[PDB]
Amino acid sequence: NVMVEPHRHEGVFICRGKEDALVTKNLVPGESVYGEKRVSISKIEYRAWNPFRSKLAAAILGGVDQIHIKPGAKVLYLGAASGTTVSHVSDIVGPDGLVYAVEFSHRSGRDLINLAKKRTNIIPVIEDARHPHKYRMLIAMVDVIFADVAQPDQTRIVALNAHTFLRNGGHFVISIKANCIDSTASAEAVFASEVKKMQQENMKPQEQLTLEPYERDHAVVVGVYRPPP
Amino acid sequence: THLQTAPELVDRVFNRPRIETLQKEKVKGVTNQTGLKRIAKERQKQYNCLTQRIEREKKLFVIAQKIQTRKDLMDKTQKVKVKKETVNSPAIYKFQSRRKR
Amino acid sequence: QNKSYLAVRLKDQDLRDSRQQAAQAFIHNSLYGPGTNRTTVNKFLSLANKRLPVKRAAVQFLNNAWGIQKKQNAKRFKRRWMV
Amino acid sequence: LSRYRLKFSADKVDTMIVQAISLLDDLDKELNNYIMRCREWYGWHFPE
Amino acid sequence: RDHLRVNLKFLTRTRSTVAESVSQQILRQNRGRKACDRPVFTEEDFQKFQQEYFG
RNA sequence: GUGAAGCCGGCUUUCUGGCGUUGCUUGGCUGCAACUGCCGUCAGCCAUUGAUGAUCGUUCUUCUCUCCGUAUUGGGGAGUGAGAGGGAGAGAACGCGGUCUGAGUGGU
């Protein structure tokens, strides 16, 4: 009874019917990662992507032009946490792609390894994102960097990681929480300051979108790193 | 022009596929008009049930506190009422400060 | 809705930091705000005139912005006085 | 490397605690069924 | 075969929306209940009367 | 479950059978081949069910098709063809589904 519509982002679908859900094709059929419900069409199974819990899902539903996470792409994911959003990213990139999930917390790390056991295209890295040199052996050159660390010098952390592992012309997607950067300043003032700091390194922000319906005081910035001449 | 999508699709922010995507893809599943009406009615039923459960949660939270507030009153310690009871909130009391021996 | 979507050039939207403005305001109130003991430069330089062997007036005797309409009427009254 | 960072060793893993006691129940049910068959089949020869 | 005309008809005609009263109740439960999460007679009439009438 | 009816052929074998198609040929009602292709005719042999159970039981969508052909809006038939749906068994993930209380007891 379900009808499925293609989404503008490759690898992403939208599911209607009894459920109003944004979905991705399940890489491991018959398995649920964190209790999300699944639907089948005929042969093909999809997993619901919760926008209330995830921030990338909120950005996609918010009307973002580009996410740059595509099938067969290498993604470096900073701030993996338990891996709820990581599992959907692993679905999009498919068997050809690789996801590097970096998480410093030990309790969230234990959930990643269980998820990484069932998915071959996820590479768990239990390290600190402030020191990209401490895990350079594990990560090759990547295409997209996603950062959701929610920590005051997020811009410097991304730039250090982008210089070491992000190819020329690669893209970055950064989630910014206004009250984490500065609790007392206004949200739009905080967001503009981060835009200035990105320009200081060789990062060109191309768009900015706020996550009003599912979160508050959050913004997502998509840009390119070392753009070709 | 910048999004490379049709002007009508600009209105729907949640899903606005590109022109080349639209002419190379196909919507999958139920496509008949009669089924789509049945699809629309299912959305109303699920959203109404979500609305009803949320409102039940708000009332049950209030009821538990009022019973808890009444249970605190069964204490010999002196107390002063600082607020009256309402439908949304129980009455707030301040108790005299004595250490428990 | 055109109001939701905005296009801006990269260098124009860079403006003064609000956090910086609060830092400047803290210095101003700490040195020239209410509660401090500050006088004017005209008054401060006029203390020497009160102690000289020949007393003089204030260093800057005219106040430019005390009055403008009142200044004109005084000239009008003066011209009448010579008749 | 992730197991080393999370202090996962052969001693710390408690999965074999869950596996052993699940198997320990299964062996008890199996032993009960087979013993009744020895007593029933041999009871037609020497019931005492 | 070109599906652009067909896709446009299915992506526009089926327009439906939940009520505002429905949406506003969902978005407040997501906020939480913690303190950080959650958001004709005057004294002149009485005073003058007692001066004039009973004063 | 029912309970008495079904089906009617083969191999030898003459008349040096005919009727045919399909390729090549041909001056020529010319030949050459192929048939898992039909209709016989002439005699001989062989085989020739059932109460110890004859007869009789299936939805949908489709294709692999095929023959008549109402070839134009067709119809059927044969498909170990695919699935959908139904029955039985063996697994996996998830759900029902929500983890008592909270300051007094004993001796004198």
Side-chain angles (χ1 to χ4, degrees), chain B residues 10 16, chain C residues 1 5:
Chain B
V10 178
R16 49 164 75 101
Chain C
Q1 51 179 357
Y5 308 112

Side-chain angles (χ1 to χ4, degrees), chain B residues 30-75:
Chain B
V30 175
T31 51
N32 47 307
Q33 170 168 350
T34 70
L36 293 169
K37 295 194 294 291
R38 186 201 64 191
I39 294 304
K41 301 292 103 177
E42 283 314 317
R43 286 195 292 270
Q44 307 317 297
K45 288 175 69 69
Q46 304 293 128
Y47 273 100
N48 182 91
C49 171
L50 179 49
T51 288
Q52 278 189 116
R53 291 189 184 274
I54 285 168
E55 198 272 333
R56 294 177 70 191
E57 198 268 342
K58 182 165 69 177
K59 291 186 291 187
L60 284 183
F61 186 74
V62 172
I63 296 195
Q65 283 184 352
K66 288 188 179 181
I67 304 163
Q68 188 47 57
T69 303
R70 291 186 189 99
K71 187 143 59 49
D72 305 339
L73 292 177
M74 294 177 71
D75 176 9

Side-chain angles (χ1 to χ4, degrees), chain A residues 102-193:
Chain A
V102 184
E103 175 65 26
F104 195 28
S105 172
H106 295 285
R107 60 165 199 91
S108 298
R110 288 189 293 270
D111 301 5
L112 281 183
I113 289 176
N114 300 324
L115 178 64
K117 284 177 197 178
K118 286 170 173 183
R119 287 167 181 268
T120 308
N121 61 353
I122 295 174
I123 296 181
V125 179
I126 309 305
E127 300 289 341
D128 191 3
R130 295 189 187 93
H131 305 104
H133 66 93
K134 295 183 72 165
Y135 50 80
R136 60 208 189 238
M137 74 291 291
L138 284 176
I139 297 171
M141 185 64 72
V142 310
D143 293 331
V144 185
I145 285 179
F146 190 93
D148 201 351
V149 300
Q151 188 274 331
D153 62 330
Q154 189 165 21
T155 290
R156 181 174 54 182
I157 291 172
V158 177
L160 287 168
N161 280 287
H163 177 68
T164 308
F165 305 112
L166 186 57
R167 67 174 176 86
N168 299 346
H171 298 86
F172 53 88
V173 184
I174 297 166
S175 177
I176 307 164
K177 183 166 74 175
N179 289 344
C180 169
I181 301 299
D182 189 358
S183 55
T184 176
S186 82
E188 64 274 12
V190 165
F191 297 150
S193 297

Side-chain angles (χ1 to χ4, degrees), chain A residues 1-9 13-14 16-20 22 41-42 44 46 60-66 206-207, chain B residues 2-5 12-18 21-22 25-31 35-36 38-40 42-43 45-47:
Chain A
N1 297 295
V2 65
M3 61 80 71
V4 179
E5 302 172 355
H7 201 271
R8 73 175 275 141
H9 305 303
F13 308 87
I14 175 163
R16 303 293 295 273
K18 186 178 179 66
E19 293 83 3
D20 266 339
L22 182 78
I41 194 64
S42 57
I44 299 310
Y46 301 96
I60 290 170
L61 286 184
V64 66
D65 182 28
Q66 303 278 339
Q206 303 156 332
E207 65 183 1
Chain B
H2 184 285
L3 299 174
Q4 307 171 17
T5 188
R12 50 183 287 160
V13 62
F14 73 116
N15 189 23
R16 49 164 75 101
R18 276 169 215 102
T21 302
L22 279 175
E25 292 275 49
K26 180 51 204 197
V27 294
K28 183 171 67 178
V30 175
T31 51
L36 293 169
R38 186 201 64 191
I39 294 304
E42 283 314 317
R43 286 195 292 270
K45 288 175 69 69
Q46 304 293 128
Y47 273 100

